Ligand binder design. Structure first.
Ligand SMILES: *[C@@H]1O[C@H](CO)[C@@H](O[C@@H]2O[C@H](CO)[C@@H](O)[C@H](O)[C@H]2NC(C)=O)[C@H](O)[C@H]1NC(C)=O
Ligand SMILES: *[C@@H]1O[C@H](CO)[C@@H](O)[C@H](O)[C@H]1NC(C)=O
Ligand SMILES: *[C@@H]1O[C@H](CO)[C@@H](O)[C@H](O)[C@H]1NC(C)=O
Ligand SMILES: *[C@@H]1O[C@H](CO)[C@@H](O)[C@H](O)[C@H]1NC(C)=O
Ligand SMILES: *[C@@H]1O[C@H](CO)[C@@H](O)[C@H](O)[C@H]1NC(C)=O
Ligand SMILES: *[C@@H]1O[C@H](CO)[C@@H](O)[C@H](O)[C@H]1NC(C)=O
Ligand SMILES: *[C@@H]1O[C@H](CO)[C@@H](O)[C@H](O)[C@H]1NC(C)=O
Ligand SMILES: *[C@@H]1O[C@H](CO)[C@@H](O)[C@H](O)[C@H]1NC(C)=O
Ligand SMILES: *[C@@H]1O[C@H](CO)[C@@H](O)[C@H](O)[C@H]1NC(C)=O
Ligand SMILES: *[C@@H]1O[C@H](CO)[C@@H](O)[C@H](O)[C@H]1NC(C)=O
Lengths: 25, 21, 323, 584
């Protein structure tokens, strides 16, 4: 699919920035 | 609007690296 | 046996209104089936007018609520189109709140001589069945400007179905283990569950809507199965069985609707599994626990869409793009 | 001692555990608390990590996707009130997808004021059915406890407790293995208790140290001033954020801090009705050396520009983002899926809007029965239509029955059309009156005749039975003839009957059925139009196969053909009750 939906967006976007972090202001 | 991009359309990996700081 | 009709039309609204029709091969006249309810209606309509072969006038399914398929017209192969409704219509159907199957076009052949078609406001009837009727019926040849409601035929009927495939069948003398492949539609939270149907079936001609054809009753035992974690193969162990008995089984998926009126789905074919042996009976009757309400289905679907919307709101709120 | 630690702003704590150092001094949060997205943590991290000073959160708590945390009995041992002044999508406590979380352990959570609880996808969380939410929430009907370990009958639930017989069973109520739910008696409802039961001051909320002391409570239920639970605060002060009162130097001080254009997320604070507020309501501006809202010369309505001229209203948070605003300079879309009913806070939040210069879209809403929550809306300018040139759009609403009370409300569309599809509970009478009242000219409105009003009784005029003949089996009925102002638009009658041993049979509502408690429906052709006012033309019907000495509930409805003409709504009789004659 490559539609990162659901909780797969979380666990599959964590593999992109596992040590950098998610962005916030 | 990450659900408006990566869930409804398909995100590229750089466009999805945007959210990682 | 020709059965002429007084005053042309013949409204049928019950079992009894059809019992003036038993043994009729060719009905001279038109029929307006308008069935709003009844009791054990499928086999009774099959017994009363399953033998109808040809109808000289037109046919009409005005507002008929109880029936699920027109499969009880088993030998119906020709509508002559002599008498027509206004609009030059040889088949007419509207406001059919449970009409899900028109006919099984793999096994059935219908000829419509003259007169167009009409399908407005059939909620659970797919357009694929309608186009199959357009082609098999004899309207593509002899091109007729048929009038089919494109937007109100198929409402809450999944018509884009993929194919589930079984993987594992482990028989016993009183239990059967089944595991089919995992399914996920393009958003996996849409899949609410599967619906294992089964039915003891001594013959391999059991289609989906054979049996039930009625609101209020059903021929298939139904099991509703939550999905697994997203890999795991799902399945079910059927438990209260009989030894040395052939069964008919399929699995159908039920999904939610996206915010565009777009549906998905998959539906495994009918497979027959016989158990092992040890040391008015067409069906069972099936109310040891009577099945799930359609309004309860819509409540469950809305519960699903509500969990999906809250999760979407949370992922929208938390993740912030780089400026 | 009520609140010795400070009063913090809203905390967002992600990607680490370090930012939780900033909760070492928070007794009350004037904001929300998002603890979320902590992947590389372990229960060895959450062992020496405790926040006992935290007492109340004004907005909401959000725990999302945190590994290693097993119980909140160490993080929040004394969280006593969530106020819920700002919710998180209707909800005030959200415990979502906490993986290693074993038990809640919120054993001081005694009262959540506004908004409810949602707790789901906690795969190994138990101790849920022993919490007694009815004594925790003012409204319990929209909690959400789905998808847990306790979803399986597996998890435990053993604890030594008041043993409520509130439901039909004997459930001892407990948070942990070693903490029971503190159940006050019937009298001291939310004011406070001691372990002796000697109830404390009525101006308090949740727990309290000393009985009958306005300072030795825990959380105040009305207001906070100088370490004391005050009921209303007297005005040399001003109220502030619905929970505490404060001096004028503070409110002008925050006006000075946002008066300098340092960000674009603050507001220059003013005062209205003794309450320090972000900006003045409609019809007021501030006197600059006084910062109080004085009425303007005539109208000065509060205009609220929408981001990209569009805003979807989907919960109490998104609705509350339009509190106070009276001009909407863009378009709204209400999309409120599922839930029980939340038109009350839709009315408290979207009640005062008078203008919209865009379109008003209503899509996919399920728990809405009426748009009366638009209490004061009178104008849709149509200056930014939806594509298809619509100023009012309505689609796929399963429970909407009433647009407005048209005997009491005016509405006007300056330009644009009307859209009404898939609205089964909303009669065409309400839509037709909307087209008449709104000023819509002919304008070619797509108002779908067959997908509107399908599942509701939509007959204004009425029928009556004239002649009744009972028997042991049959019943003859004749009712007084209906004829529409065009008798071509009369399809037939729908005679309903069922069997009823009592007379508590509710009226038919539009949804159909055939199973067992189902109206047997007979379709009847209309009689021949005799062109005589007094003739044979009375319609009737004979009921054949009925059983003796039994009571049937009967009525009759008409069946008509709709059109773009706004007439022929048909006639509906009333429920009568017939006892058939007995026999041998
Ligand atoms: C928690 O305490 C609050 C007071 O802050 C109670 O809220 C009041 O409840 C009554 C009826 O229950 C409502 O009519 C009022 O509108 C509420 N007041 C406010 C300010 O919201 C609440 O009942 C308590 N919760 C319980 C007892 O579960
Ligand atoms: C998280 O913590 C590490 C060390 O504790 C630090 O270097 C980093 O900047 C922090 N923040 C993010 C967003 O990773
Ligand atoms: C049907 O009946 C009508 C009138 O009774 C007659 O004219 C017609 O020929 C009949 N058709 C057939 C096929 O019997
Ligand atoms: C129906 O058929 C008749 C004759 O075949 C034709 O004259 C008429 O135009 C048709 N269409 C109608 C009535 O809409
Ligand atoms: C299936 O086959 C059996 C015998 O082979 C027959 O009696 C039965 O009527 C058939 N069912 C259908 C729907 O054709
Ligand atoms: C919290 O209070 C302590 C006690 O004085 C102080 O040292 C510290 O700076 C305060 N702030 C934080 C963020 O810990
Ligand atoms: C209430 O407050 C007292 C003192 O503040 C404390 O000992 C007790 O644990 C609190 N909670 C309950 C449930 O009594
Ligand atoms: C107003 O109250 C604040 C504390 O909330 C205090 O710091 C300030 O000095 C007060 N101003 C007065 C009393 O003028
Ligand atoms: C919509 O409105 C614009 C301007 O009023 C007009 O140019 C356009 O043709 C309209 N479209 C339709 C479908 O009515
Ligand atoms: C509605 O409009 C009428 C006439 O335009 C006016 O008299 C009345 O005051 C308005 N407001 C209501 C009924 O609240």
């Amino acid at each position: 699919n490559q539609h990162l939906c659901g909780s797969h967006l979380v666990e599959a976007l964590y593999l992109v920035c596992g040590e950098r972090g998610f962005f916030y202001t | 609007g990450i659900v408006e991009q990566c869930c409804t359309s398909i995100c590229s990996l750089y466009q999805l690296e945007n959210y990682c700081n | 046996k020709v059965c002429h009709l007084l005053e042309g039309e013949k409204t049928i609204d019950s079992v009894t209104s059809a019992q003036e029709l038993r043994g009729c091969t060719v009905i001279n006249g038109s029929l307006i089936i308008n069935i709003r309810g009844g009791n054990n209606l499928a086999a009774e309509l099959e017994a009363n007018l399953g033998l109808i072969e040809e109808i000289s006038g037109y046919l009409k399914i005005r507002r008929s609520y109880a029936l699920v398929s027109l499969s009880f017209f088993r030998k119906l192969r020709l509508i002559r189109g002599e008498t027509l409704e206004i609009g030059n219509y040889s088949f007419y159907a509207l406001d059919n709140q449970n009409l899900r199957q028109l006919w099984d076009w793999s096994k059935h052949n219908l000829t419509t001589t003259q007169g167009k078609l009409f399908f407005h406001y059939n909620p659970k009837l797919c357009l694929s069945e309608i186009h199959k009727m357009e082609e098999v019926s004899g309207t593509k040849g002899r091109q007729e400007r048929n009038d089919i409601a494109l937007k109100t035929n198929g409402d809450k009927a999944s018509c884009e179905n993929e194919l589930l495939k079984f993987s594992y069948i482990r028989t016993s003398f009183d239990k059967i283990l089944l595991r089919w492949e995992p399914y996920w539609p393009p958003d996996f939270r849409d899949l609410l569950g599967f619906m294992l149907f089964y039915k003891e079936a001594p013959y391999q001609n059991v289609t989906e809507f054979d049996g039930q054809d009625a609101c209020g009753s059903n021929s298939w035992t139904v099991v509703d199965i939550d999905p697994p974690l997203r890999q795991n193969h799902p399945g079910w162990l059927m438990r209260g069985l009989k030894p040395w008995t052939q069964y008919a089984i399929f699995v159908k998926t039920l999904v939610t609707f996206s915010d565009e009126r777009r549906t998905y789905g998959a539906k495994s074919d009918i497979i027959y599994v016989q158990t092992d042996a040890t040391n008015y009976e067409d069906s069972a009757g099936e109310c040891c626990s009577c099945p799930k309400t359609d309004s309860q289905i819509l409540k469950e679907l809305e519960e699903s869409s509500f969990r999906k919307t809250f999760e979407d709101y949370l992922h929208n709120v938390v993740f912030v793009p780089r400026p």
